[PDB]
Amino acid sequence: LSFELLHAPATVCGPKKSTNLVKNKCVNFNFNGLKGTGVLTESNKKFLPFQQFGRDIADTTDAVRDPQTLEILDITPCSFGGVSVITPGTNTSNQVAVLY
């Protein structure tokens, strides 16, 4: 067996497509080379058959179709955002409040 590495367009590759699926939980998926984190959710929109993945105004993967299943999934990240602390002076007391 003689191989040619990085001398032709990619035609033959191995089984790198993961095993299963997880819904309602943000995971670091890899949709055929597109790695990102988001919660897989069913999308109301209709996808044309030739389309592979969707892009929002931010030019980021927010929708995608499965490489094996014709159904389409949405990429929405799980709970993110900053946290703020409301506290009085340290000379007065020490109780604090947490606001998201």
């Binding site: 931010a58 980021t60 955002g81 900053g82």
Partner: peptide, 22 residues
């Protein structure tokens, strides 16, 4: 609200967040 500022309100239509005013 008075209708004037109601009409004026009707006329005007990823890390970044918009904090509402106090």
């Amino acid at each position: 609200r008075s209708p004037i500022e109601d009409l004026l309100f009707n006329k005007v239509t990823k890390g970044l967040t918009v904090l509402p005013p106090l």
